[PDB]
Amino acid sequence: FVEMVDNLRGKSGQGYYVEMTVGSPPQTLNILVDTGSSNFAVGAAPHPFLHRYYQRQLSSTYRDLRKGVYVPYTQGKWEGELGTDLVSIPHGPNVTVRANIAAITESDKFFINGSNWEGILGLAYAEIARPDDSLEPFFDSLVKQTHVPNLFSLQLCGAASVGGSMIIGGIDHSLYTGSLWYTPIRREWYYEVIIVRVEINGQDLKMDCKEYNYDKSIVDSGTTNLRLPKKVFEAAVKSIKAASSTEKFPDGFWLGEQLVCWQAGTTPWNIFPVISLYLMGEVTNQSFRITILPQQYLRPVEDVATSQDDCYKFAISQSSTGTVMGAVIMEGFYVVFDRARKRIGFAVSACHVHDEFRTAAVEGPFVTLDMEDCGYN
Ligand SMILES: CC[C@@H](CC(=O)N[C@H]1[C@@H]2C[C@H]3C[C@@H](C2)C[C@@H]1C3)n1c(N)nc2cc(Cl)ccc21
């Protein structure tokens, strides 16, 4: 799969994109890779932030579905016109497929000024496809129309400039070390999984595990942060806050309302606790755990714009939508979306940012009881 290694690019906090082509002759676009949604959507109009956009008039293979889509979210929205056309992935499997494309024709606070992507490849399941589940997601089309196996994997590196690999239809063994550990995909809408235990340094957190998955826990390359339900956010920060009593910070920092700086090059990582999530294992009463570092949840901020030094954002934040395992979790690990076997595998990434003393890890097996009681009904 060396065709596919390092085919992801991007910029810090603007997401990871892959090169894709649409229509005949092919139009090249950068497309944000997103495991948190299920539409293939693309700029179709000359919005001033876009570098390029889908021009259906040039495509002899485009077919109008005569149907509009409206997708609103907390702050903004995208809207578009549905269609199908021929899609391929240059640094992907050497194949072409007829897929659905939403031609984005109006949006608010969707595109990122200064980014180099022009659309979004929602890699998740039909059940959260918009406007409804009859709109076949890109990846279903791909598997259905070719001999590509039903799974992909992400190695997200990140470092302004980021890179990674999306392996379509397989696993590249050089992208990780140690062994893959798999957690079940609870239902096929988002990539839903169940967290069964949470430890900060080692001190578990002693919460009804159900809090950890309220009302869901997902895996999302479209989110930067590790996001925790309100209640789990408290006990974690309060416990992280205790772990790092070699220093004192304003309450606003923990809230992701203000950032924090140290003389250019003098951050003490050791004051900061490792974080462990245990995930439901493949077997009754069996879990494993993933461990991330401060280097994962304290992220550099580019904008030393009215500052000089090394300022970091607390990259763990609260949620009314459940746990989101975003880039903060994913950049530690190689992640296999084993769609065919309804499961997600994690392994220590070969690219991840390690230091001298501590290392991101994936360990098992452990014994955890009542794991099914951790899901939401
Ligand atoms: C469910 C979690 C959220 C997180 C999120 O809001 N991501 C942002 C981010 C920046 C823009 C482009 C892309 C990644 C989706 C969305 C807007 N999310 C994801 N993963 N894909 C989304 C698509 C939409 Cl229309 C709204 C929220 C989305």
Side-chain angles (χ1 to χ4, degrees), residues 236-270:
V237 148
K238 163 192 151 86
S239 170
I240 281 157
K241 187 179 301 207
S244 53
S245 283
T246 299
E247 261 196 59
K248 208 212 77 194
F249 312 102
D251 307 304
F253 164 64
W254 305 120
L255 289 213
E257 275 162 30
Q258 106 192 174
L259 62 80
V260 64
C261 325
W262 296 261
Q263 300 180 180
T266 62
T267 347
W269 298 109
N270 293 29

PDB file of all heavy atoms in Angstrom, residues 236-270:
ATOM      1  N   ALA A 236     -12.600  14.843  35.280  1.00  0.00           N
ATOM      2  CA  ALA A 236     -11.336  14.622  34.582  1.00  0.00           C
ATOM      3  C   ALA A 236     -10.389  15.801  34.780  1.00  0.00           C
ATOM      4  O   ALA A 236      -9.249  15.626  35.204  1.00  0.00           O
ATOM      5  CB  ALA A 236     -11.598  14.372  33.121  1.00  0.00           C
ATOM      6  N   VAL A 237     -10.895  16.994  34.466  1.00  0.00           N
ATOM      7  CA  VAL A 237     -10.187  18.248  34.656  1.00  0.00           C
ATOM      8  C   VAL A 237      -9.842  18.479  36.118  1.00  0.00           C
ATOM      9  O   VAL A 237      -8.692  18.792  36.427  1.00  0.00           O
ATOM     10  CB  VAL A 237     -10.966  19.438  34.025  1.00  0.00           C
ATOM     11  CG1 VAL A 237     -10.769  20.774  34.791  1.00  0.00           C
ATOM     12  CG2 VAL A 237     -10.551  19.588  32.577  1.00  0.00           C
ATOM     13  N   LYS A 238     -10.816  18.288  37.007  1.00  0.00           N
ATOM     14  CA  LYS A 238     -10.563  18.356  38.456  1.00  0.00           C
ATOM     15  C   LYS A 238      -9.424  17.423  38.884  1.00  0.00           C
ATOM     16  O   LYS A 238      -8.692  17.726  39.820  1.00  0.00           O
ATOM     17  CB  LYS A 238     -11.855  18.076  39.238  1.00  0.00           C
ATOM     18  CG  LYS A 238     -11.692  17.718  40.704  1.00  0.00           C
ATOM     19  CD  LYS A 238     -13.022  17.190  41.238  1.00  0.00           C
ATOM     20  CE  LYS A 238     -12.863  16.188  42.383  1.00  0.00           C
ATOM     21  NZ  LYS A 238     -12.764  16.862  43.699  1.00  0.00           N
ATOM     22  N   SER A 239      -9.272  16.311  38.164  1.00  0.00           N
ATOM     23  CA  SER A 239      -8.265  15.283  38.464  1.00  0.00           C
ATOM     24  C   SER A 239      -6.935  15.509  37.734  1.00  0.00           C
ATOM     25  O   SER A 239      -5.871  15.141  38.226  1.00  0.00           O
ATOM     26  CB  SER A 239      -8.825  13.903  38.141  1.00  0.00           C
ATOM     27  OG  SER A 239      -7.831  12.926  38.209  1.00  0.00           O
ATOM     28  N   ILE A 240      -7.024  16.090  36.544  1.00  0.00           N
ATOM     29  CA  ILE A 240      -5.882  16.619  35.803  1.00  0.00           C
ATOM     30  C   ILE A 240      -5.314  17.839  36.529  1.00  0.00           C
ATOM     31  O   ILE A 240      -4.092  17.957  36.695  1.00  0.00           O
ATOM     32  CB  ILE A 240      -6.331  17.040  34.384  1.00  0.00           C
ATOM     33  CG1 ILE A 240      -6.450  15.807  33.490  1.00  0.00           C
ATOM     34  CG2 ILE A 240      -5.374  18.070  33.784  1.00  0.00           C
ATOM     35  CD1 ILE A 240      -7.360  16.003  32.335  1.00  0.00           C
ATOM     36  N   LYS A 241      -6.218  18.728  36.950  1.00  0.00           N
ATOM     37  CA  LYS A 241      -5.906  19.917  37.764  1.00  0.00           C
ATOM     38  C   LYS A 241      -5.132  19.558  39.054  1.00  0.00           C
ATOM     39  O   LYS A 241      -4.200  20.263  39.438  1.00  0.00           O
ATOM     40  CB  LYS A 241      -7.211  20.685  38.066  1.00  0.00           C
ATOM     41  CG  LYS A 241      -7.101  22.038  38.756  1.00  0.00           C
ATOM     42  CD  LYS A 241      -8.490  22.676  38.959  1.00  0.00           C
ATOM     43  CE  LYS A 241      -9.233  22.883  37.610  1.00  0.00           C
ATOM     44  NZ  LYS A 241     -10.231  24.003  37.630  1.00  0.00           N
ATOM     45  N   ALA A 242      -5.507  18.457  39.701  1.00  0.00           N
ATOM     46  CA  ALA A 242      -4.755  17.947  40.865  1.00  0.00           C
ATOM     47  C   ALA A 242      -3.362  17.384  40.516  1.00  0.00           C
ATOM     48  O   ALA A 242      -2.416  17.510  41.289  1.00  0.00           O
ATOM     49  CB  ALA A 242      -5.577  16.891  41.618  1.00  0.00           C
ATOM     50  N   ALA A 243      -3.257  16.776  39.337  1.00  0.00           N
ATOM     51  CA  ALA A 243      -2.065  16.045  38.917  1.00  0.00           C
ATOM     52  C   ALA A 243      -0.922  16.993  38.661  1.00  0.00           C
ATOM     53  O   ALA A 243       0.252  16.624  38.750  1.00  0.00           O
ATOM     54  CB  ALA A 243      -2.377  15.233  37.657  1.00  0.00           C
ATOM     55  N   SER A 244      -1.300  18.228  38.358  1.00  0.00           N
ATOM     56  CA  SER A 244      -0.372  19.254  37.923  1.00  0.00           C
ATOM     57  C   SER A 244      -0.353  20.421  38.885  1.00  0.00           C
ATOM     58  O   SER A 244      -0.348  21.576  38.470  1.00  0.00           O
ATOM     59  CB  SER A 244      -0.764  19.727  36.521  1.00  0.00           C
ATOM     60  OG  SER A 244      -2.126  20.124  36.482  1.00  0.00           O
ATOM     61  N   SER A 245      -0.353  20.102  40.173  1.00  0.00           N
ATOM     62  CA  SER A 245      -0.236  21.109  41.240  1.00  0.00           C
ATOM     63  C   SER A 245       1.214  21.540  41.493  1.00  0.00           C
ATOM     64  O   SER A 245       1.535  22.052  42.572  1.00  0.00           O
ATOM     65  CB  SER A 245      -0.845  20.596  42.556  1.00  0.00           C
ATOM     66  OG  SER A 245      -2.256  20.651  42.542  1.00  0.00           O
ATOM     67  N   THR A 246       2.091  21.302  40.519  1.00  0.00           N
ATOM     68  CA  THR A 246       3.438  21.865  40.550  1.00  0.00           C
ATOM     69  C   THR A 246       3.330  23.238  39.865  1.00  0.00           C
ATOM     70  O   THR A 246       4.232  24.084  39.971  1.00  0.00           O
ATOM     71  CB  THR A 246       4.481  20.951  39.851  1.00  0.00           C
ATOM     72  OG1 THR A 246       4.550  19.680  40.514  1.00  0.00           O
ATOM     73  CG2 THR A 246       5.861  21.592  39.869  1.00  0.00           C
ATOM     74  N   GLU A 247       2.206  23.443  39.165  1.00  0.00           N
ATOM     75  CA  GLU A 247       1.825  24.756  38.643  1.00  0.00           C
ATOM     76  C   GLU A 247       0.343  25.075  38.840  1.00  0.00           C
ATOM     77  O   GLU A 247      -0.469  24.172  39.064  1.00  0.00           O
ATOM     78  CB  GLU A 247       2.215  24.908  37.175  1.00  0.00           C
ATOM     79  CG  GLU A 247       3.505  25.674  36.998  1.00  0.00           C
ATOM     80  CD  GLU A 247       3.690  26.154  35.584  1.00  0.00           C
ATOM     81  OE1 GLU A 247       2.827  26.920  35.092  1.00  0.00           O
ATOM     82  OE2 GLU A 247       4.707  25.763  34.970  1.00  0.00           O
ATOM     83  N   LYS A 248       0.018  26.370  38.772  1.00  0.00           N
ATOM     84  CA  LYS A 248      -1.348  26.859  38.942  1.00  0.00           C
ATOM     85  C   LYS A 248      -1.763  27.701  37.732  1.00  0.00           C
ATOM     86  O   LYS A 248      -1.014  28.578  37.292  1.00  0.00           O
ATOM     87  CB  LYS A 248      -1.482  27.668  40.235  1.00  0.00           C
ATOM     88  CG  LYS A 248      -2.883  27.629  40.841  1.00  0.00           C
ATOM     89  CD  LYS A 248      -3.216  28.928  41.565  1.00  0.00           C
ATOM     90  CE  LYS A 248      -3.584  30.047  40.576  1.00  0.00           C
ATOM     91  NZ  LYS A 248      -3.571  31.382  41.255  1.00  0.00           N
ATOM     92  N   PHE A 249      -2.955  27.427  37.205  1.00  0.00           N
ATOM     93  CA  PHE A 249      -3.461  28.106  36.016  1.00  0.00           C
ATOM     94  C   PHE A 249      -4.823  28.751  36.274  1.00  0.00           C
ATOM     95  O   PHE A 249      -5.560  28.303  37.160  1.00  0.00           O
ATOM     96  CB  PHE A 249      -3.586  27.106  34.866  1.00  0.00           C
ATOM     97  CG  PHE A 249      -2.372  26.258  34.678  1.00  0.00           C
ATOM     98  CD1 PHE A 249      -2.351  24.946  35.128  1.00  0.00           C
ATOM     99  CD2 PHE A 249      -1.236  26.779  34.066  1.00  0.00           C
ATOM    100  CE1 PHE A 249      -1.222  24.165  34.962  1.00  0.00           C
ATOM    101  CE2 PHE A 249      -0.100  26.004  33.893  1.00  0.00           C
ATOM    102  CZ  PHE A 249      -0.090  24.700  34.338  1.00  0.00           C
ATOM    103  N   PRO A 250      -5.160  29.807  35.504  1.00  0.00           N
ATOM    104  CA  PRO A 250      -6.510  30.366  35.613  1.00  0.00           C
ATOM    105  C   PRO A 250      -7.585  29.332  35.200  1.00  0.00           C
ATOM    106  O   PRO A 250      -7.309  28.457  34.371  1.00  0.00           O
ATOM    107  CB  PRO A 250      -6.474  31.544  34.616  1.00  0.00           C
ATOM    108  CG  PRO A 250      -5.010  31.873  34.438  1.00  0.00           C
ATOM    109  CD  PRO A 250      -4.303  30.570  34.547  1.00  0.00           C
ATOM    110  N   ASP A 251      -8.792  29.434  35.770  1.00  0.00           N
ATOM    111  CA  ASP A 251      -9.937  28.565  35.390  1.00  0.00           C
ATOM    112  C   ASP A 251     -10.295  28.614  33.892  1.00  0.00           C
ATOM    113  O   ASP A 251     -10.820  27.647  33.334  1.00  0.00           O
ATOM    114  CB  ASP A 251     -11.190  28.920  36.211  1.00  0.00           C
ATOM    115  CG  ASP A 251     -10.936  28.920  37.711  1.00  0.00           C
ATOM    116  OD1 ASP A 251     -10.465  27.891  38.252  1.00  0.00           O
ATOM    117  OD2 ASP A 251     -11.216  29.960  38.352  1.00  0.00           O
ATOM    118  N   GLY A 252     -10.021  29.755  33.263  1.00  0.00           N
ATOM    119  CA  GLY A 252     -10.320  29.974  31.854  1.00  0.00           C
ATOM    120  C   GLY A 252      -9.521  29.092  30.904  1.00  0.00           C
ATOM    121  O   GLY A 252     -10.006  28.744  29.828  1.00  0.00           O
ATOM    122  N   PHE A 253      -8.299  28.734  31.291  1.00  0.00           N
ATOM    123  CA  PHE A 253      -7.474  27.834  30.491  1.00  0.00           C
ATOM    124  C   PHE A 253      -8.097  26.423  30.292  1.00  0.00           C
ATOM    125  O   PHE A 253      -8.257  25.943  29.155  1.00  0.00           O
ATOM    126  CB  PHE A 253      -6.088  27.737  31.114  1.00  0.00           C
ATOM    127  CG  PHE A 253      -5.297  26.584  30.620  1.00  0.00           C
ATOM    128  CD1 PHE A 253      -4.916  26.513  29.294  1.00  0.00           C
ATOM    129  CD2 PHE A 253      -4.933  25.570  31.482  1.00  0.00           C
ATOM    130  CE1 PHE A 253      -4.201  25.462  28.833  1.00  0.00           C
ATOM    131  CE2 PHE A 253      -4.194  24.501  31.030  1.00  0.00           C
ATOM    132  CZ  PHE A 253      -3.825  24.448  29.704  1.00  0.00           C
ATOM    133  N   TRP A 254      -8.442  25.784  31.411  1.00  0.00           N
ATOM    134  CA  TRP A 254      -9.180  24.520  31.438  1.00  0.00           C
ATOM    135  C   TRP A 254     -10.487  24.562  30.660  1.00  0.00           C
ATOM    136  O   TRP A 254     -10.963  23.533  30.164  1.00  0.00           O
ATOM    137  CB  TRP A 254      -9.526  24.132  32.887  1.00  0.00           C
ATOM    138  CG  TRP A 254      -8.370  24.046  33.832  1.00  0.00           C
ATOM    139  CD1 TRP A 254      -8.189  24.776  34.957  1.00  0.00           C
ATOM    140  CD2 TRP A 254      -7.239  23.180  33.719  1.00  0.00           C
ATOM    141  NE1 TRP A 254      -7.009  24.427  35.559  1.00  0.00           N
ATOM    142  CE2 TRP A 254      -6.403  23.448  34.818  1.00  0.00           C
ATOM    143  CE3 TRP A 254      -6.849  22.204  32.789  1.00  0.00           C
ATOM    144  CZ2 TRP A 254      -5.200  22.771  35.028  1.00  0.00           C
ATOM    145  CZ3 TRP A 254      -5.647  21.533  32.990  1.00  0.00           C
ATOM    146  CH2 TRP A 254      -4.839  21.817  34.114  1.00  0.00           C
ATOM    147  N   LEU A 255     -11.082  25.745  30.580  1.00  0.00           N
ATOM    148  CA  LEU A 255     -12.334  25.913  29.849  1.00  0.00           C
ATOM    149  C   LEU A 255     -12.151  26.179  28.339  1.00  0.00           C
ATOM    150  O   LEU A 255     -13.137  26.278  27.595  1.00  0.00           O
ATOM    151  CB  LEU A 255     -13.225  26.976  30.520  1.00  0.00           C
ATOM    152  CG  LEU A 255     -13.883  26.662  31.872  1.00  0.00           C
ATOM    153  CD1 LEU A 255     -15.228  27.357  31.948  1.00  0.00           C
ATOM    154  CD2 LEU A 255     -14.075  25.161  32.105  1.00  0.00           C
ATOM    155  N   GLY A 256     -10.893  26.258  27.895  1.00  0.00           N
ATOM    156  CA  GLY A 256     -10.574  26.515  26.491  1.00  0.00           C
ATOM    157  C   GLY A 256     -11.030  27.909  26.091  1.00  0.00           C
ATOM    158  O   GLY A 256     -11.413  28.141  24.943  1.00  0.00           O
ATOM    159  N   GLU A 257     -10.995  28.823  27.069  1.00  0.00           N
ATOM    160  CA  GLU A 257     -11.366  30.241  26.917  1.00  0.00           C
ATOM    161  C   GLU A 257     -10.149  31.166  26.780  1.00  0.00           C
ATOM    162  O   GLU A 257     -10.266  32.274  26.236  1.00  0.00           O
ATOM    163  CB  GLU A 257     -12.231  30.711  28.099  1.00  0.00           C
ATOM    164  CG  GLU A 257     -13.718  30.416  27.949  1.00  0.00           C
ATOM    165  CD  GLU A 257     -14.480  30.492  29.270  1.00  0.00           C
ATOM    166  OE1 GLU A 257     -14.088  31.259  30.176  1.00  0.00           O
ATOM    167  OE2 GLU A 257     -15.489  29.769  29.395  1.00  0.00           O
ATOM    168  N   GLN A 258      -9.003  30.728  27.295  1.00  0.00           N
ATOM    169  CA  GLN A 258      -7.758  31.485  27.185  1.00  0.00           C
ATOM    170  C   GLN A 258      -6.649  30.462  27.046  1.00  0.00           C
ATOM    171  O   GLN A 258      -6.839  29.301  27.413  1.00  0.00           O
ATOM    172  CB  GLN A 258      -7.544  32.397  28.410  1.00  0.00           C
ATOM    173  CG  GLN A 258      -6.653  31.751  28.981  1.00  0.00           C
ATOM    174  CD  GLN A 258      -6.594  32.415  30.343  1.00  0.00           C
ATOM    175  OE1 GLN A 258      -5.906  31.993  31.258  1.00  0.00           O
ATOM    176  NE2 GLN A 258      -7.377  33.506  30.450  1.00  0.00           N
ATOM    177  N   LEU A 259      -5.505  30.864  26.500  1.00  0.00           N
ATOM    178  CA  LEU A 259      -4.385  29.932  26.411  1.00  0.00           C
ATOM    179  C   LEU A 259      -3.276  30.236  27.387  1.00  0.00           C
ATOM    180  O   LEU A 259      -3.371  31.194  28.158  1.00  0.00           O
ATOM    181  CB  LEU A 259      -3.845  29.802  24.986  1.00  0.00           C
ATOM    182  CG  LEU A 259      -3.250  30.978  24.235  1.00  0.00           C
ATOM    183  CD1 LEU A 259      -1.807  31.206  24.691  1.00  0.00           C
ATOM    184  CD2 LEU A 259      -3.326  30.689  22.750  1.00  0.00           C
ATOM    185  N   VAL A 260      -2.231  29.413  27.351  1.00  0.00           N
ATOM    186  CA  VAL A 260      -1.143  29.495  28.332  1.00  0.00           C
ATOM    187  C   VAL A 260       0.239  29.312  27.704  1.00  0.00           C
ATOM    188  O   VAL A 260       0.413  28.474  26.826  1.00  0.00           O
ATOM    189  CB  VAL A 260      -1.352  28.469  29.477  1.00  0.00           C
ATOM    190  CG1 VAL A 260      -1.293  27.012  28.947  1.00  0.00           C
ATOM    191  CG2 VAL A 260      -0.361  28.718  30.627  1.00  0.00           C
ATOM    192  N   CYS A 261       1.215  30.085  28.177  1.00  0.00           N
ATOM    193  CA  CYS A 261       2.525  30.192  27.508  1.00  0.00           C
ATOM    194  C   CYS A 261       3.720  29.939  28.442  1.00  0.00           C
ATOM    195  O   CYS A 261       3.614  30.141  29.656  1.00  0.00           O
ATOM    196  CB  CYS A 261       2.669  31.565  26.812  1.00  0.00           C
ATOM    197  SG  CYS A 261       1.126  32.274  26.081  1.00  0.00           S
ATOM    198  N   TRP A 262       4.840  29.480  27.874  1.00  0.00           N
ATOM    199  CA  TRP A 262       6.132  29.402  28.596  1.00  0.00           C
ATOM    200  C   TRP A 262       7.305  29.823  27.705  1.00  0.00           C
ATOM    201  O   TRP A 262       7.301  29.528  26.501  1.00  0.00           O
ATOM    202  CB  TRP A 262       6.406  27.990  29.109  1.00  0.00           C
ATOM    203  CG  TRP A 262       5.452  27.476  30.146  1.00  0.00           C
ATOM    204  CD1 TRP A 262       5.640  27.459  31.502  1.00  0.00           C
ATOM    205  CD2 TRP A 262       4.174  26.868  29.910  1.00  0.00           C
ATOM    206  NE1 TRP A 262       4.552  26.888  32.123  1.00  0.00           N
ATOM    207  CE2 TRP A 262       3.638  26.520  31.169  1.00  0.00           C
ATOM    208  CE3 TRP A 262       3.423  26.600  28.755  1.00  0.00           C
ATOM    209  CZ2 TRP A 262       2.389  25.911  31.307  1.00  0.00           C
ATOM    210  CZ3 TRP A 262       2.182  25.994  28.890  1.00  0.00           C
ATOM    211  CH2 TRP A 262       1.679  25.654  30.157  1.00  0.00           C
ATOM    212  N   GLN A 263       8.348  30.392  28.303  1.00  0.00           N
ATOM    213  CA  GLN A 263       9.410  31.000  27.522  1.00  0.00           C
ATOM    214  C   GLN A 263       9.788  30.017  26.443  1.00  0.00           C
ATOM    215  O   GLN A 263       9.991  28.828  26.687  1.00  0.00           O
ATOM    216  CB  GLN A 263      10.618  31.312  28.404  1.00  0.00           C
ATOM    217  CG  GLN A 263      10.324  32.273  29.544  1.00  0.00           C
ATOM    218  CD  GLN A 263      11.545  32.559  30.395  1.00  0.00           C
ATOM    219  OE1 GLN A 263      11.478  33.319  31.361  1.00  0.00           O
ATOM    220  NE2 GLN A 263      12.670  31.951  30.039  1.00  0.00           N
ATOM    221  N   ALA A 264       9.845  30.544  25.225  1.00  0.00           N
ATOM    222  CA  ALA A 264      10.003  29.713  24.015  1.00  0.00           C
ATOM    223  C   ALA A 264      10.952  28.498  24.193  1.00  0.00           C
ATOM    224  O   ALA A 264      12.177  28.607  24.045  1.00  0.00           O
ATOM    225  CB  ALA A 264      10.385  30.586  22.782  1.00  0.00           C
ATOM    226  N   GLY A 265      10.363  27.358  24.556  1.00  0.00           N
ATOM    227  CA  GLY A 265      11.100  26.105  24.689  1.00  0.00           C
ATOM    228  C   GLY A 265      11.190  25.509  26.085  1.00  0.00           C
ATOM    229  O   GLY A 265      11.904  24.515  26.290  1.00  0.00           O
ATOM    230  N   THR A 266      10.474  26.091  27.049  1.00  0.00           N
ATOM    231  CA  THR A 266      10.550  25.607  28.441  1.00  0.00           C
ATOM    232  C   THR A 266       9.223  25.074  29.041  1.00  0.00           C
ATOM    233  O   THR A 266       8.817  25.480  30.138  1.00  0.00           O
ATOM    234  CB  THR A 266      11.155  26.673  29.383  1.00  0.00           C
ATOM    235  OG1 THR A 266      10.314  27.832  29.384  1.00  0.00           O
ATOM    236  CG2 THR A 266      12.580  27.051  28.953  1.00  0.00           C
ATOM    237  N   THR A 267       8.561  24.160  28.331  1.00  0.00           N
ATOM    238  CA  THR A 267       7.373  23.499  28.873  1.00  0.00           C
ATOM    239  C   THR A 267       7.756  22.257  29.687  1.00  0.00           C
ATOM    240  O   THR A 267       8.565  21.439  29.238  1.00  0.00           O
ATOM    241  CB  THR A 267       6.397  23.073  27.770  1.00  0.00           C
ATOM    242  OG1 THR A 267       6.747  23.691  26.524  1.00  0.00           O
ATOM    243  CG2 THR A 267       4.982  23.455  28.160  1.00  0.00           C
ATOM    244  N   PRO A 268       7.193  22.115  30.901  1.00  0.00           N
ATOM    245  CA  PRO A 268       7.445  20.883  31.643  1.00  0.00           C
ATOM    246  C   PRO A 268       6.292  19.887  31.415  1.00  0.00           C
ATOM    247  O   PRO A 268       5.200  20.036  31.977  1.00  0.00           O
ATOM    248  CB  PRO A 268       7.521  21.359  33.102  1.00  0.00           C
ATOM    249  CG  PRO A 268       6.696  22.666  33.132  1.00  0.00           C
ATOM    250  CD  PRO A 268       6.371  23.055  31.685  1.00  0.00           C
ATOM    251  N   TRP A 269       6.540  18.900  30.560  1.00  0.00           N
ATOM    252  CA  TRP A 269       5.529  17.923  30.196  1.00  0.00           C
ATOM    253  C   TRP A 269       5.202  17.023  31.383  1.00  0.00           C
ATOM    254  O   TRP A 269       4.071  16.531  31.509  1.00  0.00           O
ATOM    255  CB  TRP A 269       6.019  17.061  29.034  1.00  0.00           C
ATOM    256  CG  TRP A 269       6.293  17.809  27.759  1.00  0.00           C
ATOM    257  CD1 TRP A 269       7.523  18.057  27.202  1.00  0.00           C
ATOM    258  CD2 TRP A 269       5.320  18.384  26.863  1.00  0.00           C
ATOM    259  NE1 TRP A 269       7.374  18.751  26.023  1.00  0.00           N
ATOM    260  CE2 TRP A 269       6.037  18.971  25.790  1.00  0.00           C
ATOM    261  CE3 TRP A 269       3.915  18.467  26.867  1.00  0.00           C
ATOM    262  CZ2 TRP A 269       5.390  19.634  24.718  1.00  0.00           C
ATOM    263  CZ3 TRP A 269       3.273  19.124  25.808  1.00  0.00           C
ATOM    264  CH2 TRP A 269       4.013  19.696  24.747  1.00  0.00           C
ATOM    265  N   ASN A 270       6.188  16.826  32.255  1.00  0.00           N
ATOM    266  CA  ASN A 270       6.069  15.854  33.342  1.00  0.00           C
ATOM    267  C   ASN A 270       5.063  16.188  34.425  1.00  0.00           C
ATOM    268  O   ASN A 270       4.537  15.297  35.076  1.00  0.00           O
ATOM    269  CB  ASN A 270       7.444  15.540  33.911  1.00  0.00           C
ATOM    270  CG  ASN A 270       8.301  14.801  32.909  1.00  0.00           C
ATOM    271  OD1 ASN A 270       8.137  14.972  31.688  1.00  0.00           O
ATOM    272  ND2 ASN A 270       9.197  13.955  33.402  1.00  0.00           N
TER     273      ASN A 270
END
